[PDB]
């Protein structure tokens, strides 16, 4: 059979639960992550977002 | 005197050297940072950038 899986991009340990969008230096990225890893990414960026300013 | 300073947004303590653009969950941000803190931010994102895909 042909099996198609949405795999977690960060640790590859299991399936992803969501696709998270983020950005750096004018480049936009997407990443498929478990709920746990999406939570880690959001946590890593939390204080930076709090210190930054919204722009278009 | 009117004193003007470009202040690091993250630590409020150092002089800012550059503005970094970044984004999370569909919102885009700018932040003025010392060279050291800009490197810290880019470092925090390094593992995620490497694992993710453009657009």
Residue numbers in the entry:
A (entry chain B): 4 to 59
B (entry chain A): 4 to 58
Can you provide the manuscript's text about this entry?
Lsr2 from M. tuberculosis is a small, basic protein (Mr = 12.1 kDa, pI = 10) that is highly conserved in mycobacteria and related actinobacteria. Lsr2 is a DNA-binding protein that likely influences the organization of bacterial chromatin and gene regulation by binding to AT-rich segments of DNA. The Lsr2 dimerization domain forms a compact homodimeric α/β structure. The dimer forms a 4-stranded anti-parallel β-sheet such that the helices are arranged in an antiparallel fashion and are on the same side of the β-sheet.
Here, we report the structure of the N-terminal dimerization domain of Lsr2 solved by X-ray crystallography at 1.73 Å resolution using ab initio methods. Crystals grew from one of these constructs (Nterm2) after a few days but this was dependent on “maturation” of the protein sample (by some unknown process) over a long period of time. In retrospect, this “maturation” process amounted to degradation of Lsr2 at Lys-4 to generate a truncation product with Lys-4 as the new N-terminal residue. The structure in the monoclinic space group P21 was solved at 1.8 Å using the latest version of the ARCIMBOLDO program. A 14-residue long model polyalanine alpha-helix was used as the search fragment to arrive at the ab initio solution. We subsequently learned that these absent residues at the N-terminus had been cleaved by contaminating proteases in the case of the P21 crystals. The monoclinic crystal structure reveals a linear chain of dimers formed by crystallographic symmetry. The N-terminal end of each dimer forms a single ß-strand (ß0) that is then paired with the N-terminal strand of a neighboring dimer to form the linear oligomer chain. The oligomer is not only stabilized by interstrand H-bonds, but also by a network of polar interactions between Lys-4 (the new N-terminus after truncation) and its oligomeric neighbor.
